[PDB]
Design a protein around this ligand. Structure first.
Ligand SMILES: [Cl-]
Lengths: 349, 301, 50, 205, 103
C-alpha cells in the first residue's frame, strides 16, 4: 500500500504546522524570558515554594507547600491553559512527524534534490523544523513549572491529572538534551536521511563559492556574453539555483548530526558537513534565536566513544569560521551590490 | 545640435573604436586604465575637442540652464504678486482655533472683516458697466499665473528631443536584438570617451574643464543622453565608471601614462555625482507597452 | 500670456496625507486549537481519499 | 533588491506572457515526447502526467491580455504526489530510472510559478521580515545610511522593508500579528520623518 | 577643481542624494496603510520656513532690538530661492508652501 501513504500531502501539512508551532513556541520563550512579560505565578514571592516543589518532583504528580496554590487553582487553569496546550500541540506534532518518518523508512524512498526536489526539500525541512523545535523547547527554562502548575491545579479541581500530562511530562524529560535523544532516535532514519543530504553535494558546494570565483564566472552578468541576451537563463536544476544557502546549511549541519554514523563511514558526507561548519559560527533556530554550532556539536561528540576523532574536525572548522568566514561574506556583499545594481539597471532599460 | 555639434559627433563616431569591451576585474585597475588610454587615444588627441566640441556643448547647457533658472525666478515673482493680491481677492490664510470654536465658524467671520476689501464685488455693487468689465478682466489676469498649475521646462526639453532626428544619435539596430554593449555607435558611448578626457587630471598650474566650461557642459551632454533614453545604458557601460568600480575593489595606485590612478578615480566620482544629479533632475521634469521576446520554439510547431 | 502659454504644460503635482489608514481596519482573529487534518489538500489536484 | 522586486511587480504581465508561451509551445511538446516513450506506468500516474500536458496546451497569451488569475497549485501538488508515487521502492514507474523526467518537470514547475506565483516568489527569495526581530540593528543601519551622503541615496530601502513585516506571521499565532503590524507602521513613519528632517536640515544650512 | 570640496558642495550633494530617496516612490503600502514620503518633507519645510522667518526677525523684547526690514526681506528672498530649487529634486509644489507660510 505505498501509493496510499499520501507523502506529498502529509509533508506539506506537517511542514506548515511546524512553522506555526515554532512561531507559538518562540513567543512563549520571549514572554517567559522577560520578567515583565512572565506569568505572575512564576514571579510571585509567595508561590515560589509551591513551584520549587513541582519542578523538583517533575514529572511525578502528587501539604503545607501547595497552601498558596490551593486558593489560586481556578486562575492558574485559566491563565496557563494557553501555554499548556501549546506544549501539548508540540507533542502531537512530534508524534505525527515520527510516524511519517517511520513510514518513509518502510517505503525505502529514493531521495535526490536534483530530481525529486519537492519530496527531498520537504523531507529535509520537516526534520530540521522538528529538530529546531525541540531545541527551542529546551530553552524555555520555565516549561516544567508551567506544565506542572497547570496540571497540579487541574488535579485539585477535577480530581485527576490532565489527559495529556503523563505523555507531555515524559516528552519534556526525554528531550531535555534534545540533540542527544534525537541522534539515537534517528538511527533507523539514517539511511534515507543520509541519502537525501548526500544529494546536496550536487548543489551546496557550487552554491557556496567565493567572491573571487563569482567574478571568474561573471555571476549574474547579463552583458558578459552580449549575443545571449535573448536566450533563456536555465539549468536542469532550476529550483536549486535560488534555494536558500542558509536553509541548506541547516540541513547539512543538523542532518549529519542526526545520522552521525555516516560521518565516520563516508568521506563525501564528512567533507560536506565540514564545508558547512567552516561557513558560519551560528545558525538561526527561528528568527533571532540562534544556535552556536561548534560548542554544541563538541558537547555531543565528547560524550560518545567512536567519534573522538570528530572533535578535531569541529575545532579546525571553528577556527576557520572565526578567521575567514566574516571576510568571505564581506567580499560576497561587495560583489552582490555591483551585480544587483547592474542587473536592476539593465532590466529597467 | 543639427549644425556644428552634429558635424563633430558624426566625425568623432568614426574616429571612435568600432568595438570597446569593458575588461574584466582580474586585469586590475592600472591595466584597465592603460587599455582605455590606448583604445581612446584618438578622442584624447583630437585637437578641437575642447575649443569646438566642449565649447558648443557648454553653450547648449547654458541655454537650457537659463530657461530653468528664468522659470524659477518667474515663479518667485508670481507667488509674491499673488500674496499681495490675496486681500482684494477674498483669499484668507488659515486661522488659529481655540477650544470651543470651529474652523468654519471663524473663517466666515474673518471673511466678513475683509469684505470691504473684496474688489470685484464692491465694483459690481457701485461701479459702471465699463468699470465692472475692466475689473473682471483685471481680476482674471491677476489670479491666473504660471505658478498656479503650469510649468515650462518639460516643454523646453520635449522640443529639444525633436532636434535629434538624425540617425547617428541612436545608431543602427543592435546585433543581439536587445541593446548594444561592446559597440560604440550611440552618443552616450562618445560622451563616455569625452568624459574619459575631462576626468584626466591636469598639472597643478593648468586650468581644468570645470574652470573653463563649468556645469553647462555636463548639463548638455547629459540632456542629450536622457532625451535619447540612453542614461541607463550609459550608467552600465561608461568607461570611467567601470575603472572607478574596479579601482574601488582592488585599491591599486599607479601612475599610468602620466595619469595618477587614485587622483583619476577621485575625479570620476565627482563627475559621477554631478551626472547622477543632472540625469535625475532631467528625468524628474520629463515625467507604454514594452518590447517582449519569444521563448524557444520546438520544430514541432 | 498667449505667447508664454505656448511654452507651458500642466504640472502634475497634488496634495495628500502623510498616512492614509485603510477604510476597514483588520479584524483581530482569536486563536482556536484544531487537530492536524490530512484531508485539506484532497480537493487540490488529483486527490486521494482515506 | 527592492528595485528587482519592483520590476517583478510592475512588469509581471511581461513575465506571465513569456512563460505561458513557454509552457504551451515547448514544455508541452517535450513532456509529451517523454511520456509517450514510457513503456509501463500505472493509471494513476498516467492520468496525472497527461493532465500536466492538458493544462499547459490549454494556455494562451490571450488569458494574460484579459488579465486572468491563473492557478497552478493543483499541478504543482500533483508533481509532488507523482514524486512520492515514483520514489518509493518497487514502484512500477521508478523515478531513479527516469532522472531526466524529474529535471524536466522541475523546470516546468518553475515556469508555472512565473505565471501565477510572482508575489509568493518574492517572499520566498527576498523576504526580510527578520529585521522585525533585529529592530536595534535595523534602526542603526538606517542612521548609518543617513549620515553617509553616498548611502543616504538608498535610505528609502528601510521604510520599504517595513512592508515585509507581515510575511513573518502564521495563521497559528494571531496573537502577535497586530503587535508586528503596529511595529511596521511605527518604524515606517519614523524612517520617513527622519529622512524628511535631514533634508530639512540640509536645506536650512 | 572639483577635488576641492566646499561646505556648499557637501550640503548640495547630501541634499540631492537624499531627495532621490524621498522622491523614489510616490507612496508605499505597509499593512494596508498608505505612506507618502514627500508629504513628510512638505510638512517639515512649512514648519521650518515659518521658524526661520521669525528667527531672522531677531526680535528681543528686553533690548528692544529687531532686524532691519530690508535685511529680513533679503534673507527671506535667499531662502525662497533655495526652497524653489527643491522642485528640481522632489515632486512637490513649493509655491503652495510659500503661500501657506507667508500669508
Ligand atoms: Cl517585535
Amino acid at each position: 500500500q505505498p501509493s496510499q501513504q499520501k507523502l506529498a500531502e502529509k509533508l506539506t501539512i506537517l511542514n506548515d504546522r511546524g512553522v506555526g508551532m515554532l512561531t507559538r513556541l518562540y513567543n512563549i520563550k520571549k514572554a517567559c524570558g522577560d520578567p515583565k512579560a512572565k506569568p505572575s505565578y512564576l514571579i510571585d514571592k509567595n508561590l515560589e515554594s509551591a513551584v520549587k516543589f513541582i519542578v523538583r518532583k517533575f514529572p511525578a504528580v502528587e501539604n503545607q507547600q501547595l497552601a498558596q496554590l490551593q486558593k489560586e487553582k481556578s486562575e492558574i487553569l485559566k491563565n496557563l491553559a494557553l501555554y499548556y496546550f501549546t506544549f501539548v500541540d508540540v507533542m502531537e506534532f512530534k508524534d505525527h512527524v515520527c510516524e511519517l518518518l517511520n513510514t518513509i523508512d518502510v517505503c525505502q524512498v529514493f531521495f535526490d534534490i536534483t530530481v525529486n526536489f519537492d519530496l527531498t526539500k520537504n523531507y529535509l525541512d520537516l526534520i530540521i523544523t522538528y529538530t529546531t523545535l525541540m531545541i527551542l523547547l529546551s530553552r524555555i527554562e520555565e516549561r516544567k513549572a508551567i506544565i506542572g502548575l497547570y496540571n497540579y491545579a487541574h488535579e485539585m479541581t477535577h480530581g485527576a491529572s490532565d489527559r495529556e500530562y503523563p505523555r507531555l511530562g515524559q516528552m519534556i524529560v526525554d528531550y531535555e538534551n534534545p540533540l542527544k535523544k534525537m541522534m539515537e532516535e534517528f538511527v533507523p532514519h539514517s539511511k534515507s536521511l543520509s541519502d537525501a543530504l548526500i544529494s546536496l553535494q550536487m548543489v551546496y558546494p557550487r552554491r557556496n563559492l567565493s567572491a573571487d570565483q563569482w567574478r571568474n564566472a561573471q555571476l549574474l552578468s547579463l552583458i558578459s556574453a552580449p549575443s545571449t541576451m535573448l536566450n533563456p537563463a536555465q539549468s536542469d536544476t532550476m529550483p536549486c539555483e535560488y534555494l536558500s544557502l542558509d536553509a541548506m546549511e541547516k540541513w547539512i549541519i543538523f542532518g549529519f548530526i542526526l545520522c552521525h554514523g555516516i560521518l565516520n563511514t563516508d568521506a563525501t558526507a564528512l567533507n560536506l558537513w565540514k564545508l558547512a561548519l567552516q561557513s558560519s559560527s551560528c545558525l538561526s533556530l527561528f528568527r533571532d534565536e540562534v544556535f552556536h554550532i561548534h560548542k554544541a556539536a563538541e558537547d555531543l561528540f565528547v560524550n560518545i566513544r567512536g567519534y573522538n576523532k570528530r572533535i578535531n574536525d569541529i575545532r579546525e572548522c571553528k577556527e576557520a569560521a572565526v578567521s575567514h568566514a566574516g571576510s568571505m561574506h564581506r567580499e560576497r556583499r561587495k560583489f552582490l551590490r555591483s551585480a544587483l545594481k547592474e542587473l536592476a539597471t539593465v532590466l529597467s532599460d | 545640435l543639427q549644425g556644428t555639434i552634429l558635424q563633430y559627433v558624426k566625425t568623432l563616431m568614426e574616429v571612435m573604436p568600432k568595438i570597446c569591451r569593458l575588461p574584466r576585474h582580474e586585469y586590475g585597475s592600472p591595466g584597465i586604465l592603460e587599455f582605455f588610454h590606448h583604445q581612446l587615444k584618438d578622442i584624447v588627441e583630437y585637437a578641437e575637442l575642447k575649443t569646438v566640441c566642449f565649447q558648443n556643448l557648454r553653450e547648449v547647457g547654458n541655454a537650457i540652464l537659463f530657461c530653468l533658472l528664468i522659470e524659477q525666478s518667474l515663479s518667485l515673482e508670481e507667488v509674491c504678486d499673488l500674496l499681495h493680491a490675496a486681500p482684494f481677492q477674498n483669499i484668507l490664510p488659515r486661522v488659529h482655533v481655540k477650544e470651543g470654536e470651529r474652523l468654519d465658524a471663524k473663517m466666515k467671520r474673518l471673511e466678513s472683516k475683509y469684505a470691504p476689501l473684496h474688489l470685484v464685488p464692491l465694483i459690481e455693487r457701485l461701479g459702471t458697466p465699463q468699470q465692472i468689465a475692466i475689473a473682471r478682466e483685471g481680476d482674471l489676469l491677476t489670479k491666473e499665473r504660471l505658478c498656479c498649475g503650469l510649468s515650462m521646462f518639460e516643454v523646453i526639453l520635449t522640443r529639444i528631443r525633436s532636434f535629434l532626428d538624425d540617425p547617428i544619435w541612436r545608431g543602427p539596430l543592435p546585433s543581439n536584438g536587445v541593446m548594444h554593449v561592446d559597440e560604440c555607435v550611440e552618443f552616450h558611448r562618445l560622451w563616455s570617451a569625452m568624459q574619459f578626457v575631462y576626468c584626466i587630471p591636469v598639472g597643478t598650474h593648468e586650468f581644468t574643464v570645470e574652470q573653463c566650461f563649468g556645469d553647462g557642459l555636463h548639463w548638455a551632454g547629459c540632456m542629450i543622453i536622457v532625451l535619447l533614453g540612453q542614461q541607463r545604458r550609459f550608467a552600465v557601460l561608461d568607461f570611467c565608471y567601470h575603472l572607478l568600480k574596479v579601482q574601488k575593489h582592488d585599491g591599486k595606485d599607479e601612475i599610468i601614462k602620466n595619469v595618477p590612478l587614485k587622483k583619476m578615480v577621485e575625479r570620476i566620482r565627482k563627475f559621477q555625482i554631478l551626472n547622477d544629479e543632472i540625469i535625475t533632475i532631467l528625468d524628474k521634469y520629463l515625467k507604454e507597452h514594452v518590447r517582449c521576446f519569444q521563448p524557444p520554439i520546438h520544430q514541432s510547431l | 500670456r498667449r505667447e508664454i502659454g505656448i511654452l507651458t504644460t500642466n504640472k502634475n503635482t497634488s496634495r495628500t496625507h502623510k498616512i492614509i489608514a485603510p477604510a476597514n481596519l483588520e479584524r483581530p482573529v482569536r486563536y482556536i486549537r484544531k487537530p492536524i487534518d490530512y484531508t485539506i489538500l484532497d480537493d487540490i489536484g488529483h486527490g486521494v481519499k482515506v | 533588491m527592492e528595485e528587482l522586486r519592483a520590476h517583478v511587480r510592475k512588469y509581471g504581465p511581461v513575465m506571465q506572457r513569456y512563460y505561458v508561451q513557454y509552457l504551451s509551445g515547448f514544455d508541452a511538446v517535450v513532456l509529451n515526447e517523454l511520456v509517450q516513450n514510457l513503456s509501463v506506468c500505472p493509471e494513476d500516474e498516467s492520468i496525472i502526467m497527461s493532465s500536466f500536458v492538458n493544462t499547459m496546451t490549454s494556455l494562451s497569451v490571450k488569458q494574460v491580455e484579459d488579465g486572468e488569475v491563473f492557478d497552478f497549485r493543483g499541478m504543482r501538488l500533483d508533481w509532488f504526489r507523482l514524486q512520492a508515487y515514483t520514489s518509493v521502492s518497487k514502484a512500477s514507474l521508478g523515478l531513479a530510472d527516469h532522472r531526466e523526467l524529474g529535471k524536466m518537470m522541475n523546470t516546468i514547475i518553475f515556469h508555472t510559478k512565473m505565471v501565477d506565483s510572482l508575489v509568493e516568489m518574492l517572499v520566498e527569495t527576498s523576504d526580510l521580515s527578520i529585521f522585525c526581530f533585529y529592530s536595534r540593528a535595523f534602526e542603526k543601519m538606517f542612521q548609518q545610511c543617513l549620515e553617509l551622503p553616498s548611502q543616504s541615496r538608498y535610505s528609502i530601502a528601510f521604510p520599504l522593508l517595513c512592508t515585509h513585516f507581515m510575511s513573518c506571521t502564521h495563521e497559528l499565532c494571531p496573537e502577535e500579528r497586530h503587535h508586528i503590524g503596529d511595529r511596521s507602521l511605527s518604524l515606517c513613519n519614523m524612517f520617513l520623518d527622519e529622512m524628511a528632517k535631514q533634508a530639512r536640515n540640509l536645506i536650512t544650512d | 577643481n572639483r577635488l576641492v570640496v566646499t561646505n556648499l558642495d557637501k550640503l548640495h550633494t547630501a541634499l540631492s542624494e537624499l531627495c532621490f530617496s524621498i522622491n523614489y516612490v510616490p507612496n508605499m503600502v505597509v499593512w494596508e496603510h498608505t505612506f507618502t514620503p514627500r508629504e513628510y518633507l512638505t510638512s517639515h519645510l512649512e514648519i521650518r520656513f515659518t521658524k526661520s522667518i521669525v528667527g531672522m526677525t531677531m526680535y528681543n523684547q528686553a533690548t528692544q532690538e529687531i532686524a532691519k526690514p530690508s535685511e529680513l526681506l533679503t534673507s527671506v528672498r535667499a531662502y525662497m530661492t533655495v526652497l524653489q530649487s527643491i522642485e528640481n529634486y522632489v515632486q512637490i509644489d513649493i509655491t503652495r508652501v510659500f503661500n501657506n507660510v507667508l500669508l
